[PDB]
Write a protein that binds this ligand. Structure first.
Ligand SMILES: Cc1cc(N2CC[C@@](C#N)(C3CC3)C2=O)cc(NC(=O)Cc2ccccc2)n1
Ligand code: PRO
Ligand SMILES: [Cl-]
Ligand SMILES: [Cl-]
Ligand SMILES: [Cl-]
Ligand SMILES: [Cl-]
Lengths: 481, 481
């Protein structure tokens, strides 16, 4: 009912409801991931895990609790600590905390495990859930009490090796978004005001939501440097016998990616799932009505399913008798299955099937023998087309500007701005506050999204679009999630 | 290197084996442990096995919240861990961390299921849960937080549910026997030992000879219609009458790793069955006094490529900061099944020296014969580990007929197979009497482990070994985890 361009958050809520991706729950901010959503997580998890295993990153599991004494005697997703005080009706002798971060457990372990240069590099990953206690206005995948992620943490003898890993991981995050989810992203560096607190440098991939003009951070990969090694005394004796601090990285990516995929590819009809991650790629809809199944149509449906599955196509036959074919068409459209295969009496009488693409609605009459190759072709086409259209929208959403008087216009067009910036942090705070004020008066704030790796030329003497001081680099700004 | 002997101080041996093989890091909070990458590799092998198999059965993965409300939890709790505070302030309502997810998932099941067309519903989750007991913990075997999978299905009939119960139990037998080379006994739990709220619990039970204790390896419950009544999970059948669903739930945990360690470990540390070894063959180049250094490394990489063509999992330990003898000890204590040594002598002869971990036997193998001979050796090692463990299991069970045989058999560190009337009060009586007699860290009580599927014949008039009433079935008892 709600149109994506007119009432975006209503559209998002409804499209997620009707798609059966999630279910509600009696504790606020929590959402059940049903298979239609969880399978997408499984796909990107397998891709990213295969790739980091090639880099020698090994998975691990740390306890979810920290002792009161370890906390009393690192910035997390919650400012305060959640305490477990009882088991059943019995008070614990000492209350324990749900860990605010994994770093508080992992880094003391790293300080024990690393003693010598022979022990480096150390590369660990953990797939797990994460809890937040101070979410506001929850919404599936974007603002939740609990989400899923992977977090990698590595330690190296040199900063050069650590940085190399940071960038390799950022490239894997680009591939996670662009090759699996068909979502284009922009590689860049965070501002001093937006990077990880105690780290040296934060790199990020950023996406864009045209319907509200907002940038959204897709994933991050931090050069932590030696600051945490000094805090946690993670030292190694080098080849010459001198004690040195390790150079660390950490990197994470969450189920927020599913939300970004949803928002990127949905239309007024509902979700559109990229074929590479869809739980079902082709739904076979028999043109049947209740109490009339002779076996002719369902038998051919089953033969077609077998044939498609031998080409590794994920197929479901919706043979539920109590629904009309048109009901099923709309049901699977709203889920965003990328292809629908229609088989009725006429198709049986002709040796063909009618196949409809979800992204464009185009229909193809395809002989049974041709189904498996043609479908593979179509799915790649759909995947590619989903990405390129999104990429086009991304580039139409960014305006390259020179001066501050160009900001509020572009923000009113629901656009990001790429502007020469002196990178002075106080100026980012000033720009946020005054774009926020301006927005208020006009009826919010605009902040740095990233400093892109891809830098256009900077003419000699170009001045900062805000302070008028010498500009350092081109910086991508916008309203933000 | 391990120095405690498995048959002398079993607990010290076990701690040494799991720490020196880099599987476990002990932790500030008792009963919680850091699971290091070497352990996580084995977990990932059995996880992949079981996940692939349940996908063939149509079970889909999902993710439900880690928290559960007081009212859902108690519609149904001394192991449940309560979050009661955030910072210094009480939560308005305490919430529980999941010890299991029946009460989390089944309100959603009742919402989702309306028609016989909605069945069977088959969901699974891979996650961690928390059971905060104060009895003695053991890394892997009995912990306060652990990784597991939990599957939950709903069916139109009891018979279909029971088929799935038994199919999953067979997958747990394969998990232990086929992957981990650990023999298990299928049975049903006694009325007193079955899952609370369920109808019938089936189990696979393992045995640890060094301390004489049985342990439940995995469990598969027929929940029946009991939880369907609790949560109003109903469907309209084909005739239009409302019926309760018939449910199953099943789980298996990282306990499986503990049982593998204890089953196959020896005085030198771990022994990993080839089917779950992430490194099946470690290649050790013998570099001494610069003799053929480049040639040896090249031939090692060639041999790695050749072996990977046969799907053998190979690692070259060409780390320069360790001697060959160090690498021998390192990969032995970590339990790599096969070690391949290549030095100048081996290069000259066109062979390699291969040492199998379980027996220490050495082989001189031509390069051309390496892949078929190593495949044969690995299947021989796998089968031999299983057969030796199965022999120890058989020797650890005494078949008895009267209660005065119980304490001697328990004192030989054995289980007992006894005819039992299956009256539930007699199990409490037997636990208490055997505890008292044990006196004259873990409990000395003998409880039922399972009523085996495999039933010896019950001669007419056989008396229950404890009550003297007519025996019903043969029952396996022991001290237990
Ligand atoms: C590692 C692991 C496993 C399992 N259990 C249980 C039965 C089951 C089976 N089969 C579950 C259904 C799957 C299993 O594996 C249980 C546990 N801890 C606990 O009971 C809590 C605890 C902690 C310290 C001391 C005593 C007790 N710890
Ligand atoms: O804890 C148990 O025993 C059952 C089986 C997994 C889900 N709940
Ligand atoms: Cl997958
Ligand atoms: Cl740098
Ligand atoms: Cl954001
Ligand atoms: Cl695997």
């Amino acid at each position: 009912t709600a149109k994506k361009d007119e009432n975006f958050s209503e559209w998002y809520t409804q499209a997620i409801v009707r798609s059966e991706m999630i279910e509600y729950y009696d504790i606020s901010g929590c959402y059940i991931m049903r298979p239609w959503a969880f399978h997408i997580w499984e796909k990107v998890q397998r891709f990213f895990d295969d790739e980091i295993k090639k880099m020698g990153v090994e998975n691990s599991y740390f306890p979810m609790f920290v002792s009161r004494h370890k906390l009393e005697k690192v910035e997390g997703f919650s400012p305060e600590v959640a305490w477990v005080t009882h088991y059943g009706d019995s008070p614990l002798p000492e209350k324990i905390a749900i860990r605010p971060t994994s770093e508080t457990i992992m880094y003391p372990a790293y300080a024990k495990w690393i003693r010598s240069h022979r022990d480096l590099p150390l590369k660990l990953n953990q797939w797990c859930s994460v809890v937040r206690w101070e979410f506001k206005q929850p919404t599936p995948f974007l603002r939740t009490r609990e989400f899923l992620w992977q977090e990698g943490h590595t330690a190296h003898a040199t900063e050069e090796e650590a940085w190399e890993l940071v960038l390799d991981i950022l490239e894997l995050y680009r591939r996670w978004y662009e090759e699996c989810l068909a979502v284009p992203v922009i590689k860049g560096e965070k501002s001093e005001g937006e990077k990880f607190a105690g780290g040296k440098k934060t790199t990020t991939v950023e996406a864009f939501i045209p319907e509200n003009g907002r940038g959204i951070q897709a994933a991050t990969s931090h050069l932590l440097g030696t600051n945490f090694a000094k805090m946690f005394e993670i030292e190694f004796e080098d080849e010459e016998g001198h004690k040195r601090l390790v150079h660390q990285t950490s990197w994470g990516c969450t189920t927020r990616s599913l939300g970004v995929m949803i928002m990127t590819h949905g239309d007024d009809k509902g979700l559109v799932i990229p074929p590479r991650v869809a739980s079902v790629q082709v739904v076979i809809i028999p043109i049947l009505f209740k109490d009339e199944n002779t076996g002719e149509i369902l038998g051919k449906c089953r033969e077609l399913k077998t044939m498609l599955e031998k080409a590794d196509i994920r197929v479901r036959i919706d043979d539920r008798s109590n629904y009309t074919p048109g009901w099923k068409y709309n049901h699977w459209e709203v889920k965003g299955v990328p292809l629908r295969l229609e088989l009725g009496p006429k198709d049986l009488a002709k040796g063909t099937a009618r196949v409809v693409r979800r992204d464009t609605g185009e229909a193809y009459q395809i002989s049974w023998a041709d189904l498996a190759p043609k479908l593979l072709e179509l799915m790649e086409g759909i995947q590619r087309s989903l990405f390129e259209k999104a990429k086009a929208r991304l580039h139409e959403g960014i305006e390259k500007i020179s001066t501050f008087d160009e900001v509020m216009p572009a923000l009113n067009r629901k656009h990001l701005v790429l502007a020469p910036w002196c990178e002075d942090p106080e100026s980012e705070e000033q720009i946020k506050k005054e774009t926020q004020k301006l927005s208020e008066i006009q009826a919010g704030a605009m902040k740095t999204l990233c400093i892109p790796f891809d830098q256009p030329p900077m003419p000699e003497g170009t001045k900062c679009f805000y302070t008028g001081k010498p500009a350092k680099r081109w910086t991508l700004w916008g309203r933000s999630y």
